[PDB]
């Protein structure tokens, strides 16, 4: 169920400064490379330790690629101002997501190439890698321009070929590091909250990767319509945190059981309130 | 490796 993704951003700035360009590469949703035009000495930089493998030429040529992309976004931003007949002295964002999904058979599942202007979908390559979807009229100008130049043939060639070739290479190079997981340590807390009722809250900490499920249940059944759940959040050390919580009556806390499902867990933890 | 674009928008 594997993937590569390169996320790219350009931001216009009113005044003397050219647009800021940031490119981030992801393997299996794990950041491994970054480029930032605002850096002191702008180049692609490794992020995971397993990329220090690659030699000077890799960095040097990827850095040269970035610098061409930078100009590409600079020119694309300008053209877009013209299309939407926008005024000068604004800050506008251009964004690109691009990559390939992969089976365990090392075979292309899906190719992705899409753009957004001002956080709205602008243009995207369709699943076939041959045709385009244009969100508005300005995008339709682009679509025509790209049909006449034969752009999709070239994106296709990158996606089916080079994206996939390179995703293979990266998974072989950092096999030990993507394997890593961290078990949730979980506990329950008790928060005399109102008059009559309490809050029970199931924490899960120290865990990686981020994906996780927490469930409260009362005597067989699952309590989804009366539960409060928080978006999963990073600790900042590499691990993650999440908690789920329920509003129960005092005295009957032993009835309720929390449950925690995770990849790195050899079996799902079940939990109950203790004094 | 990273994608590279062709014609500008």
């Amino acid at each position: 169920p594997h993937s590569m993704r390169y996320f790219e951003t350009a931001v216009s700035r009113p005044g003397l400064e050219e647009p800021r360009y940031i490119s981030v590469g992801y393997v299996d949703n794990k950041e491994f490379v970054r480029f930032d035009s605002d850096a002191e000495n702008p180049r692609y930089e490794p992020r995971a330790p397993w990329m220090e493998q690659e030699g000077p030429e890799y960095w040097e040529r990827e850095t040269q690629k970035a610098k061409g992309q930078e100009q590409w976004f600079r020119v694309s931003l300008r053209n877009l101002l013209g299309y939407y007949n926008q005024s000068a002295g604004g800050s506008h964002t251009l964004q690109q997501m691009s990559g390939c999904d992969l089976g365990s058979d090392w075979r292309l599942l899906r190719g992705y190439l899409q753009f957004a202007y001002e956080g709205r979908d602008y243009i995207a390559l369709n699943e076939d890698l041959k045709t385009w979807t244009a969100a508005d009229m300005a995008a339709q100008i682009t679509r025509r321009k790209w049909e006449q130049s034969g752009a999709a043939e070239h994106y296709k060639a990158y996606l089916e070929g080079e994206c996939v070739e390179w995703l293979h290479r990266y998974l072989k190079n950092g096999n030990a590091t993507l394997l890593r997981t961290d078990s949730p340590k979980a506990h329950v807390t008790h928060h005399p909250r109102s008059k009559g009722e309490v809050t029970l809250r199931c924490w899960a900490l120290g865990f990686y990767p981020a994906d996780i499920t927490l469930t409260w249940q009362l005597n067989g059944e699952e309590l989804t319509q009366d539960m409060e759940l928080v978006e999963t959040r990073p600790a900042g050390d590499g691990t993650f945190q999440k908690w789920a919580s329920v509003v129960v009556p005092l005295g009957k806390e032993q009835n309720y059981t929390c449950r925690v499902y995770h990849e790195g867990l050899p079996e799902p933890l079940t939990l109950r309130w203790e004094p | 490796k990273a994608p590279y674009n062709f014609a500008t928008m």
């Epitope: 040529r61 061409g68 100009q71 020119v75 070239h154 060639a157 070929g161 | 062709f6 014609a7």
Partner: T-cell receptor
Amino acid sequence: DQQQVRQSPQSLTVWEGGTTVLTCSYEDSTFNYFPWYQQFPGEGPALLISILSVSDKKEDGRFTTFFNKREKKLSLHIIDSQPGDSATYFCAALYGNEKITFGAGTKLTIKP
Amino acid sequence: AVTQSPRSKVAVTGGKVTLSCHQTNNHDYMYWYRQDTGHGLRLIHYSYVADSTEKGDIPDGYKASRPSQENFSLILELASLSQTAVYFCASSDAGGRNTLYFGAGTRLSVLE
């Protein structure tokens, strides 16, 4: 130093009606886009036809290019050689969005 | 359209010579190329925006200049005999693999 694109021959004269074969070798195995540029006397170079690594042949009518990744060589074949076709033909290669790298160019005279 | 001037130029060794180019493609990338007796297209200087220029493969003895987006100029401060050659301007959209549109050429003889 580093002949990244080697073109042969330098001048090629052929009798009208023949087929011309220009050949080209590149060093950098990563190159994955190869345009050919055609230069009529007194005019500037202009793009003739192009092929990507992923294909083995591209053909626009009379002109047709042959990529071959393994032997790391590329070639142009013109089939009904008219004198209109007399010009310098330039072989090019590049990776990704790097800048184009031209050959020294083969001068083709199609004798009428 | 890419349009150079002057179309021909004679100069004395040590003179100042200045080749000019204009284009109306609204392209950001512009280029100065050198050809030697019909062979070769070696890059001297290019530019992806005014008022900056960047070094090419053969910059020694040459200096470029990009006042407008429309105009691009190559400048020889002291012309040598070895800078006798034909020169081509080109333009292209930013991004990868865009086609070079070349001017029609400028001939330069440099003489003792």
